[PDB]
Design a protein around this nucleic acid. Structure first.
Ligand SMILES: [Mg+2]
Ligand SMILES: [Mg+2]
Ligand SMILES: [Mg+2]
Ligand SMILES: [Mg+2]
Ligand SMILES: [Zn+2]
Lengths: 174, 162, 176, 45, 97, 222
RNA sequence: GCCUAAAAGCAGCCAUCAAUUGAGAAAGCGUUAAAGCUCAACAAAUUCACCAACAUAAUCCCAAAAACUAAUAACAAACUC
C-alpha cells in the first residue's frame, strides 16, 4: 500500500487529552471501576451519593485514553482500560465512604486505581480504607520510636514494682 | 485451534476451552511483499474447483466457509474461493467435510448423480422445457463468471454458458 | 407492572380518563388512587397541576410520588396570563423578571430531577429561561414599575383583536 | 522511570528496600542521635 | 443483554463472576458480567443475586450460576468468547428451568 | 468514539418569492393554426440548450430524447410542490410550455385525405437537457430521494443530478474517452471513411460519434 | 406553547431553548389519547457495504454436445494463381 497518510489531530481529541492530563495531574485518588449498564435513575442516585462525599465520576473514550496512558507513567493500568470504564476522581482520598457506598451495589466491581502514585487493586483499596488516618499514624510513629526508651524505663522501674506487688499480694492473702 | 468441551458430573455442567497446536504458514513464500495470502503465494488466477488442497485450507470441518476478517483474502479472491468451495462440495470433492449423522446415514436414498462445475444449487433450478430457437436460445450456465480471469494456456475463452 | 407519569391537578382527581382506563388496565382501582391523591394534595391550592409518578407493582398495589408543579404554570402565574402564546417568537405573552425566575428556580429545585442531579441554581434558572422562551414570555433584566401594565394593555387589545379575527375566520370557513 | 508492580496479599513477601534502609540508618547511629531524633520529631510533629 | 431479557431469567437464584481484572484473558468474562448485570436483566427478576468477585492472583476467570432447580452451571472462561458463553448460558437456562 | 465533523451551513442562498413550480398551460395562449411537420430532429442528437445550471444546485437531467406534454408537466409540478419545502427550497422549470402541435386522425380513417387535426401540444427534449432545477439551503440526499420518482416517471431515462455529480460524470466520460485502450474508435473510422462505412452510417453520425442512435443515448459508448 | 374530546417527540401552527462525558421539544413504527418498539450522542467495537434483480398462447421442445494439449490455426466461392 502507499505510505501512511498521517491523520491530523482535531480540537475534540486535543480537548480530551488536555482534560485527561489535568485529571491525572491535579487530583490524587484515581480509581478505575467497571462501567456497569444500570438504569439512569440509579446512575443519578450514585452520582448524588458521590457528590455527597465530594467524589466525581468520569468517562473517557479508550481511543484517547489508551495512548495517553501508555505514554504516561500509568502503563500498568492497561489491563484495566479495555472494556467499559469509570474513573473515580477525587481530592483528599477518602476510600472508607467510597467502599461503603460501593458495597451497597453488589455487581459493580472495583477494578483498581492509584492512591497518590501507588497503584492498588481492590484488596489494596480495602486495606487503604481500613488503614488509619495519616495524622493518627504519624502521631503513632513517634510513640513506636520512643517505645524502646519507654520499655527501658518501665523495666528499670519494675524492680521496686516487683517487691511492691509482692507486698500487695501478701497483704491481700490475709 | 480452540475447542469447547462439556463435562456433566451429577447435575453439574462444566464448559471448558482447550487450545491445541495449529499449523502455520510455510516459511518461504514466492512473493513476500504481497498483502494477500493468495496474491502473495502467486495463486491468483491459478486455482479452480479441483484444487482441493488449496480450497480446504480455510473451511470449517462441516464444509462451511471461513470469515474474511480472519483469513485475510482480498474480497474478489474470497468470493472466488467461496464459489469454488461451493462447486467442489456440489461436485463431490471434500467428502469428509460433512456433519456426521449416524441416524441419517442408514436410510440410503437415490444414488448421487455425478456432476462438476455446477453453478446453481440442484434444488433450485427449473428444467428448461422450451430451450429456445437458434436466435433466442436458453443457454445453460456452466461454471462461475468469477473464474473468467484465470490463465488460459490454450488461448480460448471459457464457455460459461453452454 | 411499571411506572406511569401523569400531570394531575391538585385536588381535582377525577376517576375518569385520561387516568381511569390506564390504571384499570394496570389492575389498580381508580377510587383508591383518587382518594390517596386528594388526601396527599389537600394542602395544595386546588387547581394547579403537578407531575406525579405512579409505580404499579405486579400484585396490583401502587405507590405515589408527587413533585413540584409545572414550570409552565409557574411562569403563567408569575406573568399574570391564563394561556400561553400561539406563535412563539413573533408575539409576546407576558413579562417575567429575573427575580421571579430565580424564585421559581428556588421553589422548583426541591424536586426529583434537580435532587438526583446535584446542580447549582444557575442551571435551573437557565432551564426556567428556556421554558419561558418556549412559552413566549419575555424576560427583561430590571423592568417592572408600570410598563408591565403598559404592555398588558397592548396585550389585552391584541388578544381581543385575535379573538375577533379567529371568529371572523371561523365564520368565513363556515360560509365557504 | 516507571510505576510499581502493585502486588497483592496472596503471596506478599517482598517489601520495598526503603523501609529496610531507614531501619539500617536508624540502627547505625548512637543514643545521642536517638535523643536528637526524637526531640526533633517531637518539636516538628 | 436483550437475548437474556427476552428469556425470562426468573428461574435463577445466584450468578457470581470471579475474575482478576489485571490479567490478559478477562475481556470475555468482563463483558459477560456486564451483559448479565444489565438493567433489563435486573428488572426481569429481582430475586437474583449477581456477585462480581475481584481478585488479584486467582488468574482463572470463571462464572458460577446456581438456579432454583438445584442446578449449578460452572464455566471457567479462559479462552471462550463472550458470545459463546452467552449462548451456552442462555441455552442451558432455557433447557433447565 | 467517532470524531465530530462540522455541518454544511447555507447562508448565502436566498429563497425567492413563490418557490413552488408555476402552473403550465396545456395549450398556448395563441394556438398554432397552421399544422407543422413532425421534425424528429428536435429529439435526435445531443441537447445544445439548457445544459448547464443557472441558479439552482440540483436538477433533473435527461439521458435520452422524447416529448413532454401536459400530463408530464402536471405530474412534475404536483409531485415537486407536494414533496418540497417552500421555506428552504425553490424549484424552477428549464423546458418551455408545450408548443409543438401534434396532429391526430379519427379511428376508422383510411390513409390519405390530408393532414389530421391538432390533438395536443408537446415539448421536445434532447439528451443532456435539464428539466427542473432546484436550490435552497437543503442537501442533495433528500432532493435526490424525492426527485428520483419524477425522473423515473418522465418518459425518457432521467437522473437527479447536482453540480458535483454532473461535473463528476462529465470528467469520468472524458477520462474514459482519453484512456480508451483499443485504437479503433467510431469517430476516427467514420471521419476517415474506413471500410467505406459511410454507406451504412448517417451524415449525423459524424457528429454523434456513435453515442446517439435515433432518440437513444448510450453514455458508456465513449 | 396554542388548537382539540384527547394532540404526552410525533391531524396540525409557532418556537427548537436547558443539565450531564454524552440524548432532536424528536427522524421512523405504535396508542382514541398514553404506553411500548426503534433511530440518531457518549461510553464497545470497529471485513466490505451508492443505484442496479420484471409472467404469459394455442398440433410437438427443438441439431446432438462441449468451461483448457498451445489459434492472426485450419476448413471454406462464379475470387485469384
Ligand atoms: Mg421512464
Ligand atoms: Mg444508536
Ligand atoms: Mg401469472
Ligand atoms: Mg478452397
Ligand atoms: Zn488479494
Amino acid at each position: 500500500p502507499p505510505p501512511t497518510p498521517p491523520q491530523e489531530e482535531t480540537g475534540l481529541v486535543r480537548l480530551l487529552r488536555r482534560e485527561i492530563a489535568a485529571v491525572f495531574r491535579d487530583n490524587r485518588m484515581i480509581a478505575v471501576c467497571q462501567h456497569v449498564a444500570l438504569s439512569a435513575e440509579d446512575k443519578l442516585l450514585l452520582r448524588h451519593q458521590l457528590r455527597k462525599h465530594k467524589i466525581l465520576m468520569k468517562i473517557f473514550p479508550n481511543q484517547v485514553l489508551k495512548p495517553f496512558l501508555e505514554e504516561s507513567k500509568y502503563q500498568n493500568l492497561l489491563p484495566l482500560f479495555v472494556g467499559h470504564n469509570l474513573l473515580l476522581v477525587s481530592e483528599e482520598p477518602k476510600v472508607k465512604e467510597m467502599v461503603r457506598i460501593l458495597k451497597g451495589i453488589p455487581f459493580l466491581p472495583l477494578l483498581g486505581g492509584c492512591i497518590d502514585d501507588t497503584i492498588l487493586s481492590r484488596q489494596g483499596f480495602i486495606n487503604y480504607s481500613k488503614l488509619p488516618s495519616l495524622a493518627l499514624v504519624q502521631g503513632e510513629l513517634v510513640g513506636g520510636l520512643t517505645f524502646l526508651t519507654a520499655q527501658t524505663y518501665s523495666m528499670l522501674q519494675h524492680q521496686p514494682r516487683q517487691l511492691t506487688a509482692l507486698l500487695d499480694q501478701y497483704v491481700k492473702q490475709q | 485451534f480452540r475447542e469447547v468441551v462439556e463435562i456433566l458430573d451429577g447435575k453439574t455442567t462444566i464448559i471448558e476451552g482447550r487450545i491445541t497446536e495449529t499449523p502455520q504458514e510455510s516459511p518461504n513464500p514466492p512473493n513476500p511483499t504481497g498483502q494477500c495470502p493468495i496474491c502473495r503465494w502467486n495463486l491468483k488466477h491459478k486455482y479452480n474447483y479441483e484444487d482441493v488442497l488449496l480450497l480446504s485450507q480455510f473451511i470449517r470441518p462441516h464444509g462451511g466457509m471461513l470469515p474474511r476478517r480472519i483469513t485475510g483474502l482480498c474480497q474478489e479472491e474470497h468470493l472466488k474461493i467461496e464459489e469454488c468451495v461451493k462447486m467442489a462440495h456440489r461436485a463431490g470433492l471434500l467428502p469428509n467435510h460433512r456433519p456426521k449423522l449416524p441416524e441419517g446415514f442408514v436410510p440410503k436414498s437415490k444414488p448421487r448423480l455425478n456432476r462438476y462445475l455446477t453453478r446453481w444449487s440442484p434444488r433450485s433450478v427449473k428444467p428448461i422445457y422450451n430451450k429456445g430457437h437458434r436466435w433466442n436460445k436458453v443457454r445453460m450456465p456452466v461454471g462461475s463468471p468469477l473464474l473468467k480471469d484465470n490463465v488460459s494456456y490454450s488461448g480460448r475463452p471459457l464457455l460459461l454458458y453452454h | 407492572s411499571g411506572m406511569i407519569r401523569a400531570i394531575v391537578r391538585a385536588g381535582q382527581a377525577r376517576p375518569g380518563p385520561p387516568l381511569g382506563p390506564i390504571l384499570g388496565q394496570r389492575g389498580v382501582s381508580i377510587n383508591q388512587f383518587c382518594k390517596e391523591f386528594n388526601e396527599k394534595t389537600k394542602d395544595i391550592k386546588e387547581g394547579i397541576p403537578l407531575p406525579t409518578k405512579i409505580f404499579v407493582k405486579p400484585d396490583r398495589t401502587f405507590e405515589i410520588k408527587i413533585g413540584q408543579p409545572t414550570v409552565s404554570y409557574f411562569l403563567k402565574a408569575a406573568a399574570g396570563i391564563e394561556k400561553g402564546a400561539r406563535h412563539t417568537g413573533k408575539e409576546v405573552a407576558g413579562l417575567v423578571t429575573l427575580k421571579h425566575v430565580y424564585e421559581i428556580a428556588r421553589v422548583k429545585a426541591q424536586d426529583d430531577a434537580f435532587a438526583l442531579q446535584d446542580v447549582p441554581l444557575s442551571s435551573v434558572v437557565r432551564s426556567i429561561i428556556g421554558s419561558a422562551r418556549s412559552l413566549g414570555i419575555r424576560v427583561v433584566k430590571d423592568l417592572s414599575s408600570e410598563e408591565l401594565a403598559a404592555f398588558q394593555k397592548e396585550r389585552a387589545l391584541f388578544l381581543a383583536a385575535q379573538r375577533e379575527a379567529d371568529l371572523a375566520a371561523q365564520a368565513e370557513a363556515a360560509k365557504k | 522511570e516507571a510505576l510499581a508492580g502493585a502486588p497483592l496479599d496472596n503471596a506478599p513477601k517482598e517489601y520495598p528496600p526503603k523501609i529496610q534502609q531507614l531501619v539500617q540508618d536508624i540502627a547505625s547511629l548512637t543514643l545521642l542521635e536517638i535523643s536528637d531524633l526524637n526531640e526533633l520529631l517531637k518539636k516538628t510533629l | 443483554a436483550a437475548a437474556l431479557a427476552r428469556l425470562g431469567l426468573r428461574a435463577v437464584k445466584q450468578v457470581r463472576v470471579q475474575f482478576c481484572p489485571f490479567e490478559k484473558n478477562v475481556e470475555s468474562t468482563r463483558t459477560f458480567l456486564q451483559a448479565v448485570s444489565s438493567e433489563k436483566v435486573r428488572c426481569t427478576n429481582l430475586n437474583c443475586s449477581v456477585i462480581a468477585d475481584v481478585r488479584h492472583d486467582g488468574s482463572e476467570p470463571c462464572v458460577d450460576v446456581l438456579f432454583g432447580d438445584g442446578h449449578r452451571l460452572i464455566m471457567r472462561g479462559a479462552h471462550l468468547t463472550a458470545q459463546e458463553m452467552l449462548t451456552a448460558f442462555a441455552s442451558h437456562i432455557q433447557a433447565r428451568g | 468514539f467517532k470524531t465530530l465533523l462540522p455541518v454544511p451551513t447555507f447562508e448565502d442562498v436566498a429563497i425567492p418569492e413563490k418557490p413552488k413550480l408555476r402552473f403550465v398551460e396545456r395549450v398556448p395562449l395563441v394556438p398554432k393554426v397552421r399544422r407543422e411537420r413532425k421534425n424528429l430532429s428536435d429529439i435526435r442528437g445531443p441537447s445544445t440548450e439548457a445544459t448547464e445550471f443557472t441558479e439552482g444546485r440540483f436538477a433533473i437531467l435527461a439521458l435520452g430524447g422524447g416529448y413532454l406534454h401536459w400530463g408530464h408537466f402536471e405530474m412534475m409540478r404536483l409531485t415537486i410542490n407536494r414533496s418540497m419545502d417552500p421555506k428552504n427550497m425553490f424549484a424552477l422549470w428549464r423546458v418551455p410550455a408545450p408548443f409543438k402541435p401534434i396532429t391526430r386522425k379519427g379511428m376508422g380513417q383510411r390513409m390519405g385525405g390530408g393532414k389530421g387535426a391538432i390533438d395536443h401540444y408537446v415539448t421536445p427534449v434532447k439528451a443532456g437537457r435539464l428539466i427542473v432545477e432546484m436550490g435552497g439551503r437543503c442537501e442533495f440526499k433528500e432532493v435526490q430521494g424525492f426527485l428520483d420518482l419524477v425522473a423515473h416517471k418522465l418518459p425518457f431515462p432521467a437522473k437527479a443530478v447536482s453540480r458535483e455529480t454532473l461535473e463528476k460524470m462529465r470528467k469520468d466520460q472524458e477520462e474514459r474517452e482519453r484512456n480508451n485502450q483499443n485504437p479503433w474508435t467510431f469517430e476516427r473510422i467514420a471521419t476517415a471513411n474506413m471500410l467505406g462505412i459511410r454507406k451504412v452510417l448517417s451524415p449525423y453520425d459524424l457528429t454523434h460519434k456513435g453515442r446517439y442512435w435515433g432518440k437513444f443515448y448510450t453514455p458508456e459508448r465513449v
